[PDB]
């Protein structure tokens, strides 16, 4: 088969890094009347994002074809799938070529093909880069205008050339998307972050007064925490690393920080998400069973992720563990509910069930309507975070929530139930278990009434590293 012969040979060249022969390969394909498919086009694409970007002289044909060919894939009307994106953004990257990357986004939607976030990437930055942030400002339109979200690196570039460009309007706008958005910023955006308000365009920007009345419906209006009417008061900042204590006080001016309210429809909608994804994956009858066996039970104070609190600091399944975090639970709940341990089958049976006693529990909480135990096969944590969704309670885990299955939640409303869901262990030689309840305080941006900022720096983990804010405050 002629096409079947091209697959074959453009497995070859290359996996040999032949860009050369994959060119040869595709021309002559042309002139005997093969039609490229998507397999072909996407091995072509690859192998052209090999070339390099000439240090010395005109540019390479791998790169200069590579985008040729690009263009005649989408032609051709051959569909892209996700490795035509990845392809296609670093034949862009290594190209290095703006105007170029952002013509391939054009190109997409004119032909009704949905834009990655990725394909932006070499068009955004590379005009970031070069201080263009007019043009920068028509890629984010574009990108905006898709619908594709941006993240915090498309994000802290448009802040950058904002900043460099001296545009008081897009910093704050920016500010605002990361608040949205991002809610905790990394070392080197809070450091950007930390120069802007340091800075003499920032000093020069603002109004002496304003209408309390438009900022205070402005707040109800945004659902709290902001106000998102421009930057308020005059002359310079007073800019402070810092932390909040125990109840979100500000240690630099003691500006206590806003609990932000999560809207209970926003949660039923990630609630039918959750079930969605869950049912993708699991057997549908087994996490059916699950749901309604919690329809039948309850009320739950807390939901357990038991192979977690088995397992975590320890170098085998400590039954203790577990068993200290269900009596910690029940001891706070106002009522004395048991938690609702979720288990797999497997940990049930053999051990920490090795000892009779320990065992006899696990049968009692079972028994007591406090534990369920998750088929084998199954991916547990579908189940717990149902639980606790769905019984609007809190979760037990210090799992860190951030692999692939929790990729899948997004970073909007996940990140934002969590840290007002989460209790998290810990333990010390000195005191044993403790439990770490969530803040009483959002840990995000926040914009005050009257112009104040507080920005949170993200961490790994805020228990082992105590979280660094910026306090910005107007001196007079
Ligand atoms: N610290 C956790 C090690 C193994 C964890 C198992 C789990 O989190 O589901
Ligand atoms: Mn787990
Ligand atoms: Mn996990
Ligand atoms: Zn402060």
Redesign the pocket.
């Known amino acids: 088969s002629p096409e079947a012969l091209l697959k074959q040979k453009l497995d070859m060249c290359s996996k040999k890094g032949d860009v050369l022969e994959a060119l040869r390969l595709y021309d002559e394909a042309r002139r005997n009347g093969v039609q490229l498919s998507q397999y072909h086009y996407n091995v072509l694409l690859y192998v052209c994002s090999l070339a390099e970007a000439a240090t010395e002289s005109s540019p390479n044909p791998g790169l200069s074809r590579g985008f040729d060919i690009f263009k005649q894939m989408i032609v051709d009307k051959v569909v892209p799938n996700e490795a035509t994106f990845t392809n296609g953004a670093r034949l862009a990257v290594a190209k290095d070529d703006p105007e170029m990357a952002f013509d391939m986004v054009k190109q997409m939607k004119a032909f009704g093909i949905q834009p990655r976030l990725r394909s932006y990437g070499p068009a955004l930055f590379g005009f970031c880069r070069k201080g263009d942030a007019d043009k920068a400002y028509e890629v984010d339109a574009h990108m905006v205008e898709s619908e594709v979200v941006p993240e915090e690196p498309e994000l802290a570039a448009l802040l950058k050339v904002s900043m460099d460009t001296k545009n008081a309007d897009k910093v704050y706008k920016t500010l605002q998307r990361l608040r949205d958005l991002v809610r905790q910023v990394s070392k080197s955006t809070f450091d950007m972050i930390e120069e802007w308000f340091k800075s003499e365009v920032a000093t020069k920007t603002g109004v002496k007064k304003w209408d309390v009345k438009k900022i205070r419906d402005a707040v109800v209006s945004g659902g709290g925490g902001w106000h998102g009417q421009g930057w308020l008061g005059t002359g310079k900042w007073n800019v ?1 690393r ?1 932390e909040m204590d125990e109840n979100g006080v ?6 206590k920080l806003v609990c932000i309210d999560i809207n209970p429809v926003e949660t039923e909608t990630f609630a039918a998400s959750l079930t969605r994804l869950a049912c993708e994956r699991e057997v549908k009858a087994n996490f059916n069973q699950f749901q309604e066996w919690l329809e039948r039970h309850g009320p739950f104070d807390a939901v357990i992720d038991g192979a977690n609190m088995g397992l975590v600091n320890q170098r085998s399944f400590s039954f203790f563990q577990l068993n200290n975090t269900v009596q910690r639970c029940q001891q706070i709940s106002p009522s004395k509910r048991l938690p609702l341990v979720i288990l797999h089958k497997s940990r049930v049976n053999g051990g920490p069930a090795t000892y009779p006693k320990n065992r006899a529990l696990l049968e009692k909480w079972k028994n007591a309507g406090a534990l369920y135990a998750t088929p084998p096969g199954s991916n547990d944590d579908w189940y717990w975070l149902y639980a606790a969704v769905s019984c609007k309670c809190l979760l037990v885990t210090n799992d860190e929530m951030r692999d692939h299955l929790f990729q899948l939640l997004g970073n909007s409303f996940f990140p934002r139930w969590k840290e007002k869901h989460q209790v998290r262990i810990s333990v010390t030689r000195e005191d044993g278990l403790k439990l770490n309840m969530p803040p009483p305080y959002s840990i995000v941006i926040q914009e005050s009434e009257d112009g ?1 900022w ?1 920005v949170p720096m993200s961490v790994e983990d805020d228990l082992q590293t105590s979280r660094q ?1 910026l ?3 107007r001196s007079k």
């Open positions: 402070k810092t500000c240690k630099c001016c003691k500006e104040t507080h804010w306090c910005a405050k």
